[PDB]
Design a protein around this ligand. Sequence first.
Ligand SMILES: CCCCCCCCCCCCOP(=O)([O-])OCC[N+](C)(C)C
Ligand SMILES: CCCCCCCCCCCCOP(=O)([O-])OCC[N+](C)(C)C
Ligand SMILES: CCCCCCCCCCCCOP(=O)([O-])OCC[N+](C)(C)C
Ligand SMILES: CCCCCCCCCCCCOP(=O)([O-])OCC[N+](C)(C)C
Ligand SMILES: CCCCCCCCCCCCOP(=O)([O-])OCC[N+](C)(C)C
Ligand SMILES: CCCCCCCCCCCCOP(=O)([O-])OCC[N+](C)(C)C
Ligand SMILES: CCCCCCCCCCCCOP(=O)([O-])OCC[N+](C)(C)C
Ligand SMILES: CCCCCCCCCCCCOP(=O)([O-])OCC[N+](C)(C)C
Ligand SMILES: CCCCCCCCCCCCOP(=O)([O-])OCC[N+](C)(C)C
Ligand SMILES: CCCCCCCCCCCCOP(=O)([O-])OCC[N+](C)(C)C
Length: 10
Amino acid sequence: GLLKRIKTLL
Ligand SMILES: CCCCCCCCCCCCOP(=O)([O-])OCC[N+](C)(C)C
Ligand SMILES: CCCCCCCCCCCCOP(=O)([O-])OCC[N+](C)(C)C
Ligand SMILES: CCCCCCCCCCCCOP(=O)([O-])OCC[N+](C)(C)C
Ligand SMILES: CCCCCCCCCCCCOP(=O)([O-])OCC[N+](C)(C)C
Ligand SMILES: CCCCCCCCCCCCOP(=O)([O-])OCC[N+](C)(C)C
Ligand SMILES: CCCCCCCCCCCCOP(=O)([O-])OCC[N+](C)(C)C
Ligand SMILES: CCCCCCCCCCCCOP(=O)([O-])OCC[N+](C)(C)C
Ligand SMILES: CCCCCCCCCCCCOP(=O)([O-])OCC[N+](C)(C)C
Ligand SMILES: CCCCCCCCCCCCOP(=O)([O-])OCC[N+](C)(C)C
Ligand SMILES: CCCCCCCCCCCCOP(=O)([O-])OCC[N+](C)(C)C
């Protein structure tokens, strides 16, 4: 989901 993409970004 969308928050998993943030974990990737970081
Ligand atoms: C990240 C969405 C937060 C809700 C507010 C935005 C509403 C519009 C987008 C809704 C997208 C659907 O998300 P989902 O696959 O059910 O997300 C599950 C997230 N957790 C694993 C942390 C429970
Ligand atoms: C902000 C919350 C509003 C709630 C309004 C009442 C329920 C509406 C249910 C239908 C919601 C339909 O869209 P969704 O599957 O979530 O879109 C996901 C969009 N992305 C793929 C870009 C993450
Ligand atoms: C308070 C809650 C209100 C509802 C919030 C819903 C947020 C949904 C965000 C969905 C973002 C999807 O972006 P994406 O497809 O990965 O971007 C692609 C970008 N380029 C074209 C430049 C490559
Ligand atoms: C306007 C408000 C925007 C809110 C955006 C929320 C995004 C949430 C993303 C939540 C990701 C959780 O990752 P985590 O495993 O706890 O991260 C660990 C990070 N370090 C390795 C540096 C300690
Ligand atoms: C942006 C915040 C989204 C919160 C969504 C919670 C939905 C329930 C998911 C199941 C419980 C997840 O484990 P928790 O208890 O959160 O422990 C993990 C805490 N960190 C992420 C900081 C490592
Ligand atoms: C607009 C800015 C948006 C920023 C979004 C940030 C998302 C990531 C949040 C990560 C939260 C990290 O918490 P922490 O320091 O390890 O918790 C310390 C307290 N406890 C030990 C009780 C859990
Ligand atoms: C002040 C607020 C600024 C908000 C910025 C929001 C945009 C974040 C964009 C994603 C950042 C991570 O990009 P990346 O996947 O590692 O690089 C490729 C990125 N493009 C495909 C778009 C070229
Ligand atoms: C207008 C609203 C704009 C909101 C923009 C919010 C952006 C929040 C960004 C939060 C960044 C958290 O950094 P972090 O996990 O420690 O970094 C990764 C660190 N390592 C490389 C060592 C793993
Ligand atoms: C892990 C990333 C956390 C932030 C996420 C939100 C922003 C993503 C868009 C990419 C931001 C890129 O910024 P930058 O021009 O290279 O940095 C400016 C600061 N310095 C001059 C010191 C390098
Ligand atoms: C709507 C679209 C707007 C896009 C705006 C421009 C986004 C530019 C993203 C540039 C991302 C470059 O990431 P990188 O330094 O290779 O990896 C991250 C490395 N750190 C964790 C150390 C910071």
